[PDB]
Amino acid sequence: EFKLQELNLTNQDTGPYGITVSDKGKVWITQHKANMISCINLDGKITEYELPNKGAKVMCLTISSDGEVWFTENAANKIGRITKKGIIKEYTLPNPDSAPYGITEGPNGDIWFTEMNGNRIGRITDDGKIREYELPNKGSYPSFITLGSDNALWFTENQNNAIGRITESGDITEFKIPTPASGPVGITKGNDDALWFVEIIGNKIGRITTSGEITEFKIPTPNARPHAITAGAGIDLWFTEWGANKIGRLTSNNIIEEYPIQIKSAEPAGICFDGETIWFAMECDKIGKLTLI
C-alpha cells in the first residue's frame, strides 16, 4: 500500500502550513508563527527566509513559472515574493485589511490571489502592479485558488457555499454547492481536468467540471474536517484531514481511503505531490511524506 514518515523540524516555534515542491524535489513551507519561509534541500539542509516585519501570518504559497516563490501575508495586507537571487519583495494591497490568503499562477504568468476580508480576487505582476475584482455577494470569504483546464481561475467561497470562476477579463461566475453551508476550502485541478474541492462542514470531496457539473463523495470518517486537496498520480486526489488526523485519498471508482497519521493532534494543512511523494505540512511542527510501495 503506502507508507507514512514524519520529518520533525528543528525550529519548534514555527507552524508549518503551506507546502510546495519545485523543478527539483525542493519543498518550500510557510511558517506563520516563525513569520518565515523555509526550504528543505533535496538531501538535507533547511534554509529559512525570515520576513522583515513581524506578525505577517504567512499563509499560502506557490512556485511561479520563472523560479520565484510567491506568498500571501494574511495579517500584513501584503503579497510576498522571493526572487531567484534569494531576496524578499513585499507588495501592499490597495485597500487596508484585505487579508490575502490563497495564491496561484495565471495563464499569462501573473499571480492571482484571494482576499478574504477584502471580498475580491487579486492580480499582481512581477513589476508590481495590482488590479482587483469585487465579488457579487456580500462576505463570500474566498479561500484557495487554482488554475483550471479552461484557463480561468477557480476558487472556493467558504461562506457563500460556492465554487467561483474568474477568467482573464475579470468576468466572475459562481456555482452553488448542493450541500447547504458546506464551507468549501481546498480546491485543485484534478488530472481528469475537473476541479476537485473539499467541504470542511459537509464532510465531502467535491468535483466541479469546467461546464459546471457537480458530483459529491462522502468522507467515511465523520467530522473529518478537510483543509487542502492536491492531485496525485493517475486520477488520485489526496487531502489532509485536519479534524480526523488522517490523510484521505480518492482513488479508483471515487473511493476514499484514509491513512491515519496517528501521531496525535498534528493539524495537517497544505498538501502537494512531486511525482512520487505526497508531501503535507502539519501545523504541529512537522512535515509528512507518503510514498506507495
Partner 1 sequence: XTXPFXX
Ligand X SMILES: CCN(CC)CCS(=O)(=O)[C@@H]1CCN2C(=O)c3coc(n3)CC(=O)C[C@@H](O)/C=C(C)/C=C/CNC(=O)/C=C/[C@H](C)[C@H](C(C)C)OC(=O)[C@@H]12
Q: Which residues bind a copy of itself (CB under 8 A)?
A: 23, 65-67, 84, 108-110, 125-127, 159, 168-169, 180-181, 183, 201, 222-223, 225, 243, 264-265
Q: For residues 69 and 88, what is the distance between their CA atoms, to the nearest angstrom?
A: 9
Residue closer to a copy of itself, measured from CB, 251 or 263: 263
| Phi-psi group of 59: left, alpha or beta (phi > 0 → left; psi -120 to 50 → alpha; rest → beta) | alpha
Cβ 148 vs Cβ 154: under 8 Å: yes
Cβ 104 vs Cβ 112: under 8 Å: yes
Residue closer to partner 1, measured from CB, 116 or 194: 116
Closest approach of ligand X to the CB of residue 106, in Å? 7
Closest approach of partner 1 to the CB of residue 172, in Å? 20
Cβ 114 vs Cβ 100: under 8 Å: yes
Contact range with partner 1 by CB under 8 A, out of 80-88, 100-108, 129-137, 229-237: 100-108
User: 252: which DSSP letter?
Assistant: G
Partner from Mg ion, partner 1, ligand X, none contacting 158, C-beta within 5 to 8 A by type? partner 1
Residue 287 sits at φ, ψ, to 5 deg, of -125, 125
Q: For residues 281 and 25, what is the distance between their CA atoms, to the nearest angstrom?
A: 15
Closest approach of a copy of itself to the CB of residue 68, in Å? 11
Residue closer to ligand X, measured from CB, 18 or 232: 18
Q: For residues 198 and 238, what is the distance between their CA atoms, to the nearest angstrom?
A: 10
Contact range with partner 1 by CB under 8 A, out of 101-109, 130-138, 172-180, 212-220: 101-109
Closest approach of Mg ion to the CB of residue 15, in Å? 8
Partner from ligand X, Mg ion, a copy of itself, none contacting 136, C-beta within 5 to 8 A by type? none
| Strands (DSSP E) found in 195-282 | 195-199, 204-208, 214-218, 226-231, 237-241, 246-250, 256-260, 268-273, 278-282
Closest approach of a copy of itself to the CB of residue 67, in Å? 5
Return the bridge partners of 291, or none: 3
Cβ 63 vs Cβ 44: under 8 Å: no
The position carrying cell 534541500 is: 41
Cβ 247 vs Cβ 254: under 8 Å: no
Closest approach of ligand X to the CB of residue 207, in Å? 19
Q: For residues 178 and 208, what is the distance between their CA atoms, to the nearest angstrom?
A: 11
Contact range with partner 1 by CB under 8 A, out of 85-93, 99-107, 205-213, 251-259: 99-107
Contact range with partner 1 by CB under 8 A, out of 48-56, 57-65, 202-210, 271-279: 57-65
Q: For residues 280 and 293, what is the distance between their CA atoms, to the nearest angstrom?
A: 18
Closest approach of ligand X to the CB of residue 140, in Å? 21
Residue closer to partner 1, measured from CB, 107 or 251: 107
Closest approach of Mg ion to the CB of residue 64, in Å? 5
**171-190 residues near partner 1, rule: CB under 8 A:** 183, 185
Binding residues for partner 1, how many (CB under 8 A)? 24
Residues that bind partner 1 (CB under 8 A): 17, 32, 57, 59, 65, 74, 99, 101, 107-108, 116, 141, 143, 151, 158, 183, 185, 200, 225, 227, 242, 267, 269, 283
